[PDB]
Design a protein around this nucleic acid. Structure first.
Ligand SMILES: Nc1ncnc2c1ncn2[C@@H]1O[C@H](COP(=O)(O)OP(=O)(O)NP(=O)(O)O)[C@@H](O)[C@H]1O
Ligand SMILES: [Mg+2]
Ligand SMILES: [Zn+2]
Ligand SMILES: [Zn+2]
Lengths: 250, 102, 628, 54
DNA sequence: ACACACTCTCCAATTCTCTAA
DNA sequence: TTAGAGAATTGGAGAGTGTGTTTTTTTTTTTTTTT
């Protein structure tokens, strides 16, 4: 079964990356800034791309921006698929990270959203939407490796399982793929073939000047990944953007 | 570029020192001596060490004593409202653990 | 004839409840309620004939809002719903649902029948909810019994604390691991109805579907802790508390120290012995499931307020009406009235913010009725606290580490008045806490694991007796009061009240107090003309919200002159600011937008009168008792 | 409109005075939904038959 | 010993195929 | 064209087996001995 909205969003975001076609800061000449940003990334072997929400707002009567805003968690994989093709088209040197080289895990980033919420304004109706938040940092965790994609091999026979997907808990295969063996136990995680990510936990509390009458400040836990770990510092004031999520009792 | 131009323009002035002293804590009437002291603390001295490895302190500590209604807390309020790295604490409502580390 | 729908275990038919409530909703008019009320004479024939709930529904449509209040007495006024009133109390879960689906259908019917421009899809998308209230007599928290389970209840109390918002699941989302088919499933009775096999025809496989947490749908839940009011506690015992569960609209409504009345179903549930197994305990947990919360305008109100403000005797009228049964003490009453109004709050782009609040100290002889006055202020103010000197610690008065931070008296009292009695009994250690809160109206904290600053826009009203416990005329006034100068400098008004013997005064006082015992429950009152407490509260509240006086140049000249007069001779710089603040409070009380010469002169006069300055020896600082 | 644990209980009486029980708040008002929800609880489905390869 | 999770086994319910009237 | 006799495939009833369980601060109110 296939989601048509995802494919149409994918190949519309593709066209935005191709031909946003803003004119120069000094002259009436088309500049194509996002293609230039891809070239810049190629020059310096970067892994993240920044997009302006105002540029997306004016595109195609705003429907694309609405779909990205209200259903970010559904559409984020399709946005990744859309960007991969464009980088292949104009800068295939960026697709890889001598023996063979694994693929680059690109990160899309957004800024200049219309409004900033307080920690006190987080409510369950907004789960999975795109938001921006501000507060004072009070604690930070050390950087830890998070398992992103896994690969296992069987003890009772020479067989391998690859690209197993994790979500919130450490997860392992359901069968031995070789039908000559039935053992489900004694898997081992191949640290060379599997892939990890950088992960950091930080904790924030409300701005003192914003607290309402007779009340006290609430707090929140925030997750940082990739090239943004250790950017935050205790006692500083920061502004964040991302999506709010819901975490189980593992 | 415009920031550099503005900074150069005020750097060139003959009367810059007096204007700087006069611009600390605008709401407080008089007490130019304390304002001058606050400016010099904010700028600070030069940190250094000797061949022996001993360090020489490069910064300035200040204390203000006064009888009531002398507006002495306004200086602390201005400093904590202005200086980029600063914290305000009350001697009654704080602990040694909360002051250093816990 | 046909199958029927029946509330389980009742033989009540849903058709009758639906039709009766529809008829009530589309034909009730306010005049019927006045028939149940004491007189037909009250009726305004023009207004009271109107279809009240149709008017409300039109407003809901055009204001874009989703909830309808309903006081249950109207169900008794209309003849067709006299029995529905009882059925509501006995079967709330079913009856309330019936009412909801009635209101939504009526809203649709209005736009399609009156053929209006509004989007039908928009109205179909929304949820509409009734919120019944004023159901009957309130019930004591300890007197709820196991025969009240699942019936509607009404409670009064005070709010202790609220937990943060909890996400509550409402719809589950499944996805097939092999073929990527998806299904949305409805949650009822807390159990997820997971499919046995993937429902796509060609992928009919077992264990094939799986849950996706962050594509589910959730709703807000919160728990509020309500405490028993002292009016109901048994003799020689301490108050109890009960927990309220609240959802969606009402979630963040209420703060610590609030005083409320609620309405909700009284529920009970089992609890498990361990998290591994289905074993339940024999005792059941109990709680309340609220559907409405209430705190304990018209052109006629504005007309009354403007007309009262035009009276010549207004200042004396308001002052003698805050505490009607207390004899004389007019200057004390006046100062307290100006504390109630307050100054104006000011904030600059730079140079800070300046307090509008007034601090008052009452000091003098025993039996002078100081503490009796504190009772009136504590009950008049919308928010506030009363406490005693030996009852208070430094932590309890401000804030408490518990890792979480918790509120004390001055924080609960924010925006209100904090009454402190036996002020002379608390230690110098505890009193030193008040310096920062009175000067800045903020509380700074720096302890293990917590460092922050909190707001405290709190007015202090204090009561004390002098050193030696009776005022000694052989010592100067500052030595009789005996507070240290850094703390005595922070009060806007300081009053001396003295137990001076005089036959003229004593006969009047004796006649006043003995007159209260001529009746069982007295109707007698000290004066012919006083305002009711409700209307007086309305006046003060409106004047606080709408009026914001400014300094006139004339007022500036008089303030400078007056300060130099008190100064040249001790008056500190705070005497100037407190004069400004008192003059502003006086201006609000007349509903003026400007401070004038008259207001400045009243502020000066009241300061001179409070500390008996005219009777003070200007050089020795002693008071001539003969001049009092 | 209201949450998943608020729900009351419904009874439906047939001809010949026999009664059934269903839960949830929408069943109180919508008989079509109640009738459909009633049959949906029942466990069995008949198992099924199935052309091309190579 | 008392609820649970998981494995094993046998038996009959079911549909498919062939034959003759 | 119906139907009835025989063979093959599948479901889950239910029986069995193994398993897990009880159980150094830091902050704040109060009493007591010590200078
Ligand atoms: N002017 C008055 N009007 C009304 N009651 C009065 C007056 N003067 C004294 N009383 C009565 O005398 C008693 C005063 O008690 P109280 O309010 O505690 O006075 P106080 O100033 O707080 N004295 P103390 O607590 O000893 O410092 C009460 O019963 C009052 O009703
Ligand atoms: Mg008293
Ligand atoms: Zn194997
Ligand atoms: Zn499937």
């Amino acid at each position: 079964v296939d989601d048509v909205t995802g494919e149409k969003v994918r190949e519309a975001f593709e066209q935005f990356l191709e031909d946003f076609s803003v004119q120069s800061t000094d002259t009436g000449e088309v500049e194509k800034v996002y293609r230039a940003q891809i070239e810049f990334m190629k020059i310096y072997d970067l892994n993240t791309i920044y997009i302006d929400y105002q540029h997306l707002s004016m595109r195609e009567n705003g429907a694309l921006a609405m779909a990205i805003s209200e259903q970010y968690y559904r559409f984020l994989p399709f946005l990744q698929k859309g960007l991969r093709r464009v980088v292949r088209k104009y800068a295939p040197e960026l697709l890889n990270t001598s023996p063979e080289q694994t693929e680059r895990v690109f990160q899309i980033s957004f800024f200049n959203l219309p409004t900033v919420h307080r920690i006190r304004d987080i409510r369950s109706e907004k789960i999975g939407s795109l938001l921006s938040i501000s507060g004072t940092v009070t604690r930070t965790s050390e950087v830890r490796p998070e398992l992103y994609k896994a690969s296992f091999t069987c003890d009772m026979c020479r067989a391998i399982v690859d690209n197993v997907e994790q979500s919130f808990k450490y997860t392992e295969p359901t069968f031995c793929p070789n039908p000559s063996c039935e053992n489900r136990a004694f898997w081992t995680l191949n640290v060379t073939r599997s892939r990890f990510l950088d992960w950091q936990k930080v904790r924030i509390q409300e701005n003192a000047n914003e607290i309402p009458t007779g009340s006290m400040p609430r707090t929140l836990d925030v997750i940082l990944r990739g090239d943004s770990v250790e950017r935050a510092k205790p006692g500083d004031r920061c502004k964040f953007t991302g999506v709010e999520i819901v975490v189980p009792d593992v | 570029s415009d920031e550099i131009n503005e900074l150069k323009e005020m750097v060139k002035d003959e009367h810059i020192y007096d204007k700087l002293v006069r611009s600390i804590a605008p709401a407080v009437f008089g007490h130019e001596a304390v304002k001058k002291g606050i400016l010099l603390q904010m700028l600070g001295g030069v940190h250094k060490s000797t061949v022996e490895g001993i360090k020489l302190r490069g910064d300035i500590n200040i204390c203000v004593v006064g009888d009531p209604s002398t507006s002495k807390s306004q200086f602390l309020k201005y400093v904590v409202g202005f200086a980029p790295r600063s914290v305000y604490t009350s001697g009654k409502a704080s602990s040694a653990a909360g002051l250093t580390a816990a | 004839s046909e199958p029927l729908r029946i509330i389980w275990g009742t033989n009540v038919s849903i058709q009758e409840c639906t039709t009766n409530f529809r008829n009530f909703l589309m034909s009730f008019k306010y005049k019927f309620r006045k028939i149940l009320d004491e007189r037909e004479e009250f009726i305004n024939n023009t207004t009271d004939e109107e279809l009240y709930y149709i008017k409300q529904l039109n407003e809901m449509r055009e204001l874009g809002t989703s909830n309808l209040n309903l006081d249950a007495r109207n169900l008794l006024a209309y003849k067709q719903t006299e029995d529905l009133y009882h059925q509501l109390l006995n079967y709330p879960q079913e009856v309330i649902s019936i009412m909801d689906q009635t209101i939504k259908d009526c809203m649709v019917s209005l736009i399609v029948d009156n053929n209006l421009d509004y989007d039908l899809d928009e109205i179909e998308t929304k949820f509409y909810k009734v919120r019944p209230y004023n159901v009957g007599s309130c019930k004591g928290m300890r007197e709820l019994n196991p025969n009240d389970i699942d019936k509607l209840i009404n409670l009064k109390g005070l709010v202790l604390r609220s937990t943060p918002v909890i996400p509550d699941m409402k719809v589950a989302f499944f996805k097939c691991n092999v073929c990527d088919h998806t299904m949305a499933v409805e949650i009822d009775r807390g159990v997820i109805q997971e499919p046995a096999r993937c429902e796509r025809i060609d992928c009919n496989e077992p264990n094939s579907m799986s849950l996706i947490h962050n594509r589910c749908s959730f709703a807000d839940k919160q728990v509020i802790k309500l405490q028993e009011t002292p009016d109901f506690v048994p003799d020689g015992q301490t108050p109890h508390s009960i927990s309220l569960c609240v959802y969606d609209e009402l979630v963040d409504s209420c703060r610590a120290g609030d005083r409320i009345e609620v309405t909700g179903t009284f529920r009970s549930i089992p609890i498990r012995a361990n998290s591994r197994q289905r074993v339940l305990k024999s005792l059941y947990k109990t709680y309340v499931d609220v559907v409405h919360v209430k705190k304990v305008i018209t052109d006629q109100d504005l007309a009354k307020i403007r007309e009262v403000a035009a009276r010549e005797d207004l200042y004396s009228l308001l002052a003698r009406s805050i505490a009607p049964s207390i004899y004389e003490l007019e200057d004390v009453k006046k100062g307290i009235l100006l504390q109630l109004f307050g100054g104006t709050n000011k904030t600059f782009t730079k140079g800070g913010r300046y307090r509008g609040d007034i601090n008052i100290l009452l000091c003098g002889d025993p039996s002078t009725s100081k503490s009796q006055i504190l009772q009136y202020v504590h009950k008049i103010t919308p928010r506030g606290v009363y406490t005693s000197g030996k009852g208070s610690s430094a932590v309890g008065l401000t804030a408490y580490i518990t890792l979480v931070l918790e509120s004390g008296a001055l924080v609960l009292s924010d925006g209100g008045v904090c009454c402190i009695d036996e002020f002379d009994k608390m230690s110098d250690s505890t009193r030193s806490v008040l310096h920062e809160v009175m000067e800045q109206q903020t509380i700074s904290i720096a302890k293990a694991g917590i460092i922050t600053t909190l707001n405290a826009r709190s007015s202090i009203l204090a009561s004390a007796n002098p050193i030696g416990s009776r005022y000694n005329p052989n010592l100067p006034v500052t030595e009789n009061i005996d507070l240290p100068p850094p703390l005595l400098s922070r009060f806007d008004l300081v009053y001396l009240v003295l137990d001076k013997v005089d036959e003229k005064n004593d006969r009047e006082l004796a006649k006043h107090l003995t007159n209260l015992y001529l009746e069982d429950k007295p109707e007698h009152i000290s004066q012919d003309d006083v305002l009711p407490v409700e209307f007086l509260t309305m006046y003060i509240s409106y004047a606080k919200e709408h009026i914001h006086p400014i300094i006139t140049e004339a007022a500036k000249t008089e303030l400078v002159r007056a300060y130099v007069g008190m100064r040249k001779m001790t008056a500190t710089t705070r005497q100037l600011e407190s004069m400004i603040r008192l003059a502003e409070a006086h201006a609000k009380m007349k509903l003026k937008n400007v401070v004038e010469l008259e207001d400045v002169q009243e502020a000066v006069r009241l300061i001179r009168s409070a500390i008996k300055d005219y009777a003070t020896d200007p050089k020795t600082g002693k008071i001539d008792m003969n001049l009092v | 409109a209201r949450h998943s644990r608020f729900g009351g209980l419904l009874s439906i009486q047939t001809p010949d005075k026999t009664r059934l029980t269903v839960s949830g708040s929408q069943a109180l008002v919508d008989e079509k939904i109640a009738l459909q929800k009633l049959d949906d609880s029942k466990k069995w489905n008949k198992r099924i038959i199935k052309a091309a390869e190579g």
